[PDB]
Design a protein around this ligand. Structure first.
Ligand SMILES: [Ca+2]
Ligand SMILES: [Cl-]
Lengths: 471, 117
């Protein structure tokens, strides 16, 4: 199923990268709910290998399915799902089911990981539960990609009645605990057929967490397809949504001046994107903010970055995901920790920004502002499209919100916003707070017309107003 | 995630470990360009350092055996036969580039060693 199972009036999933369960439970209540966010994508919660230096990537080397990691134990986990759901925020588990470890060691819960002899006692998995060792090295060969070891990690065999049952048990355990869905890691290295069988054995969502009767777990799958391979994202859309990686590449390239913003008129499938309701979109994720290349926009290039995030949240295409990063200078660098490997919780300081090194993009004004905008314009189509035939475009979402962009030149124009007459607070430059706008305001006449001004030297290159940020 | 980005054009540059070609050749057979072995080691270990730990072993594997990508293009397998230097002896030295004695670089296995190579 391709239904996020959000609570009414909520939108967007936030990847709270490396957060602990206690901290997520708080954020759901103190910030996520009030701002109307739909859900949280957590880091793998199942026992993984303890690696030297405790890098971020250790989470992707499973050791068992015992819920006990640096993010917290099962009690902490259940406390989180209980508290977050009651606040209308859903929890999406990062499911690492394609492999186990790439070496011998111990896991976050003390379990043994015998890579050499393929024994994972805590599951248990033995050598007969894995594919015969070989190396992934040919992307024009789907059997090689799926059946061989990815960077030396023991490749599980989901074609097995045993392994399938183990994986369905793990996932069903997560559902009994109130999770709303799953982010499927390395789906590209697994077979559509096997996944179809596994996903189909998953129980309906646990109604004791505020889920409609008969609700089905949401499934979005990681398949990095930019074309020309024996494997296609289209082979996975029949049983779930697929993470659309072409999105970030095309927007990132456009918003850095690589393309003319006027061409976004036909944004969507016209560009080679999945059909919107099969896609889960994002500007950047935990992997490509590190090694995505020139086309990917990250917090390190905030101006174009925020413009791209605004466009994503203003446009009706697909389910939206927001990256919430921890500051880093090196690609192997793990989250803020102390000498014993304990994680350092982010601190919410005065101006509701975070301390201790977490970037907290989701607490950026321009980000929760547009999450508010996407909630206000819900159920509307893109209307009043305008463009200067170059790097300036604008359009409204029905008659509930307007948005302008400039990636070249100053925008000082009278445009039809299609909004009811009134004074609106730009949610990009400021916000509505106690009868005033802390930033720019816009006065909409009776013709739905308004004089829009957005100079190219401003801190932001986007302006956004909607019917819920009106005086 | 992680291993998923160990592909040329992503966490790994195109034609990775370019300079290590001549480094394994001279170290292994005394065959190579007329420049300081210390120099070549430096260049090679530099290229290797620029690749994050999680893709290091995969980068050497590509240097050794090669890779067929999304374009259908093959990349790597630079460690080919040279007069007086058979490919296989070279190919056997390659995994040693991350060890303490050489570049001493951490990898996905946690330490300065490339299992499964
Ligand atoms: Ca596999
Ligand atoms: Cl992802």
């Amino acid at each position: 199923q391709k239904d996020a199972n959000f609570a009414s009036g909520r939108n967007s999933i936030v990847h709270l990268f490396e957060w602990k369960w206690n901290d997520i439970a708080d954020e759901c209540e103190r910030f996520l709910q009030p701002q109307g966010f739909g859900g949280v994508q957590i880091s793998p919660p199942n026992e993984y290998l303890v690696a030297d230096g405790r890098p971020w990537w250790e989470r992707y080397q499973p050791v068992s399915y015992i819920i006990n990691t640096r993010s917290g134990d099962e009690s902490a986990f259940t406390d989180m799902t209980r508290r977050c759901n009651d606040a209308g925020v859903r929890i999406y588990v990062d499911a690492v089911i394609n492999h186990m470890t790439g070496m011998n060691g111990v896991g976050t819960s003390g379990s043994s990981a015998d890579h050499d002899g393929m024994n994972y006692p805590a599951v248990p998995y033995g050598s007969g539960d894995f594919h015969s060792p070989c190396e992934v090295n040919n992307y024009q060969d789907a059997d090689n990609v799926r059946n061989c070891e990815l960077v030396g990690l023991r490749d599980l065999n989901q074609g097995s009645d045993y392994v399938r049952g183990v994986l369905i048990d793990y996932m069903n355990h997560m559902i009994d605990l109130g999770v709303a869905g799953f982010r499927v890691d390395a789906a590209k290295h697994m077979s559509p057929g096997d996944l179809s069988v596994i996903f189909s054995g998953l129980k309906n969502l646990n109604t004791d967490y505020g889920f409609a009767d008969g609700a089905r777990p949401f499934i979005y799958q990681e398949v990095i397809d930019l074309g020309g391979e024996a494997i296609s994202k289209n082979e996975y859309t029949g049983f779930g949504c697929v993470l659309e990686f072409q999105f970030g590449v095309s927007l990132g390239n456009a918003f850095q001046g690589g393309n003319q913003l006027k061409n976004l008129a036909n944004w969507g499938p016209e560009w080679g994107l999945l059909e919107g309701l099969d896609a889960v979109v994002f500007v950047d994720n935990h992997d490509n903010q590190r090694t995505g290349g020139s086309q990917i926009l990250t917090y390190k290039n905030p101006k174009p970055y925020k413009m791209a995030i605004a466009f994503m949240l203003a446009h009706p295409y697909g389910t939206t995901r927001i990256m919430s990063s921890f500051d880093f200078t090196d690609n192997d660098q793990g989250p803020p920790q102390d000498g014993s490997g304990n994680l350092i919780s982010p601190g919410i300081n005065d101006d509701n920004t975070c301390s201790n090194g977490y970037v907290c993009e989701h607490r950026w004004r321009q980000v929760y502002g547009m999450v508010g905008f996407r909630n206000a314009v819900e159920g509307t189509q893109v209307e009043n499209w305008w463009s200067n035939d170059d790097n300036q475009i604008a359009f409204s979402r029905g008659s509930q919100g307007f948005v302008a962009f400039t990636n070249g030149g100053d925008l000082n124009q009278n445009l039809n916003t299609g909004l009811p007459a009134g004074t609106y607070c730009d949610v990009i430059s400021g916000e509505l707070s106690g009868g005033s706008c802390t930033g720019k305001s816009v006065t909409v006449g009776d013709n739905g017309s308004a004089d829009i001004s957005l100079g190219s030297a401003e801190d932001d290159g986007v302006l956004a107003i909607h019917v819920n940020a009106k005086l | 995630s992680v291993g998923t980005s160990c592909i040329p054009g992503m966490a790994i540059p195109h034609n990775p470990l370019d300079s290590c070609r001549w480094y394994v050749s001279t170290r292994t057979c005394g065959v190579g360009p007329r420049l300081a072995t210390q120099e070549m080691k430096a260049r090679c270990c530099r290229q290797l350092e620029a690749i994050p730990a999680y893709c290091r072993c995969e980068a050497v594997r590509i240097l050794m055996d090669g890779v067929v990508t999304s374009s259908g293009q093959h990349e790597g397998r630079l460690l080919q036969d040279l007069p007086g230097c058979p490919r296989q002896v070279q190919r056997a030295f390659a995994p040693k580039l991350v060890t303490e004695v050489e570049c001493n670089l951490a990898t996905i296995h946690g330490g300065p060693f490339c299992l499964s190579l």
